[model samples]
Target: SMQPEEFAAAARGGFGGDAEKAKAAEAQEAMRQQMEEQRRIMLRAVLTPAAQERLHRIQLVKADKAREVEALILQNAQRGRLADKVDEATLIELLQQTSAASAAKNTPKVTMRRRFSDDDDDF
Candidate 1:
């Protein structure tokens, strides 16, 4: 003869508290590791050793740019735009193009300053 409140509590209590949360977090971490491993495997299959080396260097300097380049490479491969593996030269070309595009989008106006000399008669 369990009341509705007791039944609800029993069902909710079965979910295990902090242990459940910890288990879920661990599972999520494991999945993330697996996904990263798969991405690396795909990258190894698609990129030349030189390209991979260059990407590693970029990752150390600009991780966000590295990730953008990685995503572009993956997208190109998926779209059949890449007929062969990307070499270092190709990777460099892509990086330069992307960098130029981003620079265009983030253009800043130059500010000019005038120097006032003792003999200056400007108002």
Candidate 2:
């Protein structure tokens, strides 16, 4: 009977070797969930019912964008840029802004080359 202690030990040792890393990861996610729930409350407080539904629909389709918009709205509130609950129209603007910002980051370009055998424009 061949026992492979080295092989069996590394399955846990390689990735989860550092207890501090695991502990910190757990703590970080716990705090993140707590803040995520808090952000939900903040959005509910600051977004009109129609906007809430709009953001909810967006979350169902584009969760990351929804989260981005939520953070933007919260940032605006924190900076005193928002004095009223955001309505559907304002929410739409935020969505557009979010989409445009991402588009700017991810926009693609292409170049093409062509060859003419005979009777080219200048030839």
Candidate 3:
């Protein structure tokens, strides 16, 4: 749920004053909505028969990457790469840095795979 203050902030829309912050929030929200819609479209696209195998492969790859990051953190913790008592903020920063660096090397491309009959494969 959005906080009353946040909703008020959104509703204000920066129309009268503080338009900058309101507009920034609006732009961010728009981007988030677009990303969500893109994901939905891709998911729907891959719902056909031929896409089944490709989707399975994509899922496995995603899971594998997640595991890789998990292992990296665990290994670093065991080796004292970061303080054991580090706070969530520090952990988040570390994870963000790692992801940014790694992603630069292996950037993600939107790919959809699903299972469908030949007649419905065009989508």
TM-score attained by model 3: 0.21
Collision pairs in model 1: none
Model 3 residue 39 CA deviation (Å) reads 19
lDDT of 3 by residue, 1-123 (tens): 755574453365335666777579667667645644664344423322222343355448676644544544454434443222333223333344454444333343422332211111211
Superposed Cα deviation of residue 33, candidate 1 (Å): 30
1 versus 3: better TM-score goes to:
1
lDDT, each prediction: 0.49, 0.50, 0.41
Task: List the lowest-lDDT window of 10 residues for candidate 2.
Answer: 114-123
For all predicted structures, in order, the TM-scores are 0.32, 0.31, 0.21
lDDT of 1 by residue, 27-77 (tens): 766765564466545654455544666568778988885886676566454
